[PDB]
Ligand binder design. Structure first.
Ligand code: HEM
Ligand SMILES: CC[C@H]1OC(=O)C[C@@H](O)[C@H](C)[C@@H](O[C@@H]2O[C@H](C)[C@@H](O)[C@H](N(C)C)[C@H]2O)[C@@H](CC=O)C[C@@H](C)C(=O)/C=C/C(C)=C/[C@@H]1C
Length: 385
């Protein structure tokens, strides 16, 4: 009855049906472009239980698909295409680059990047596109430093990333992904030292990783690395511009910032609709999911679950702290989440200090939304300060 995907058409609020599903239909039967059956999971308790359940698979051969061409140029050793046990064996090689230890080590870089950017920006003028002139370059520079990827090629890989991450899109999306993967393959053939990509190249020379372990995850890290953080920064600024109380309170007490970052993550929920399939029959809440059925995890719905968050539709930096699923749940829970939280704290703290009188210069209804992207966001954010 319900089509999937449902377009996200409001920056600050997921689709209205999500509320009805959580209340009235928490394991909801829906249909893909070609009528294949999918289940929509909207409550936090069911999202977490199912995403952690060994009968739920991310394996690309049975994954629900959003068009006739979705599935073309699919990777084979990406973290996002591997089930246990392979998944953790591989993820184990990358975890040292993403722990608290390492993330705190990186924070001074991020602060310097952020400060240089805002120096230029304020010197040059009092207007800008916050995504193109600040969020995207911060996020790209950070991931370029971590991986050791030429920041100079940004034009190339940024436009491709953006096109490639539209899962229902036609040949433009597919050509972008093919070209994106050839870009990383060119960079890898060039090492054959520094950064995570140097380290991965080394481990593939020792017996340790395959070429596809290396390629597939370079693409994943580079794309997820910059697209998510750019969007989250942008969108987090947009939200704070609608909340002058919160803007002032965070400027005066930066100790509020770690908490506000979780509340922005929950509220915005830029990652939504994660896809899985069931490899066995699954009984949950009076329904039976059949082996082979598709599963869709409405993280944005679950992050507004009235059973978990009071006044869940309110953005509230003073709410009691509750765990959210903006980063997903189970074995594929965002590997970059410590880095992402640190980037956001740094970026937002700096914006508050350096641009205290920031204003938007276009209406909210006039922003262009990335509704068919896997990473929700806007195409630009015009501001003045
Ligand atoms: C800033 C906001 C970010 C959000 C909201 C976000 C959200 C997510 C979500 C929801 C997943 C799970 C996808 C699935 O289970 O199907 C995920 C996985 C991932 N994230 Fe992020 N992420 C962010 C930032 C980053 C950054 C900065 C990096 C890397 C530098 C990154 C690297 C990854 C990787 C490698 C995975 C796959 C992990 C696995 O399958 O084991 N993320 N992220
Ligand atoms: C919800 C945040 C999560 O987002 C995804 O994991 C999106 C991830 O599913 C793409 C959408 C997906 O793109 C789709 O890949 C298909 C095989 C293609 O057939 C399809 N066609 C249209 C080009 C392409 O769009 C990725 C390939 C599968 O992993 C794209 C590459 C660049 C990639 O690995 C991107 C990963 C990102 C952005 C992960 C963040 C954390």
């Amino acid at each position: 009855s319900i089509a999937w995907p449902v377009a996200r058409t409001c920056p600050f609020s997921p689709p209205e049906q999500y509320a009805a599903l959580r209340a009235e239909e928490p394991i909801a039967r829906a249909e893909l472009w070609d009528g294949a059956p999918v289940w929509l999971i909207s409550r936090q308790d069911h999202v977490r239980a199912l995403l952690a359940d060994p009968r739920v698979s991310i394996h690309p051969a049975k994954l629900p698909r959003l068009s006739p061409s979705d599935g073309e140029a699919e990777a084979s050793r990406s973290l996002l295409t591997l089930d246990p046990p392979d998944h953790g064996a591989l993820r184990g090689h990358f975890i040292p680059e993403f722990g608290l230890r390492r993330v705190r080590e990186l924070r001074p870089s991020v602060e310097q990047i952020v400060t240089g950017l805002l120096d230029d920006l304020t010197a040059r003028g009092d207007e800008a596109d916050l995504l193109a002139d600040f969020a995207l370059p911060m996020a790209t520079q950070v991931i370029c430093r971590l991986l050791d990827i030429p920041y100079e090629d940004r034009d190339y890989f940024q436009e491709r990333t953006e096109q490639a991450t539209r899962p229902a899109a036609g040949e433009e999306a597919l050509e972008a992904l093919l070209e994106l993967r050839d870009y990383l393959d060119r960079l890898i053939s060039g090492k054959t030292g520094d950064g995570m990509l140097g380290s991965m190249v080394a481990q593939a020379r020792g017996g340790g990783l395959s070429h596809a372990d290396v390629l597939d995850n370079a693409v994943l890290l580079l794309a997820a690395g910059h697209e998510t953080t750019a969007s989250m920064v942008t969108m987090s600024v947009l939200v704070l511009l609608q909340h002058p109380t919160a803007w002032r309170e965070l400027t005066v007490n930066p100790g509020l910032l770690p908490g506000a970052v979780d509340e922005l993550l929950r509220y915005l929920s830029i990652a939504d609709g994660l896809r899985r399939s069931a490899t066995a029959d699954i009984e949950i809440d009076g329904h039976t999911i059949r082996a082979g059925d598709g599963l869709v995890f409405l993280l944005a719905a679950a992050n507004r679950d009235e059973a978990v968050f009071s006044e869940p539709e309110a953005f509230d930096i003073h709410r009691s702290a509750r765990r959210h699923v903006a980063f997903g749940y189970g074995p594929h829970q965002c590997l970059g989440q410590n880095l992402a939280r640190m980037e956001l704290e740094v970026a937002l703290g700096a914006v508050l200090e350096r641009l205290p009188a920031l204003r938007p210069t276009t209406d909210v209804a006039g922003l262009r939304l990335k509704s068919d992207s896997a990473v929700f966001g806007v195409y630009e954010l015009p501001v003045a300060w």
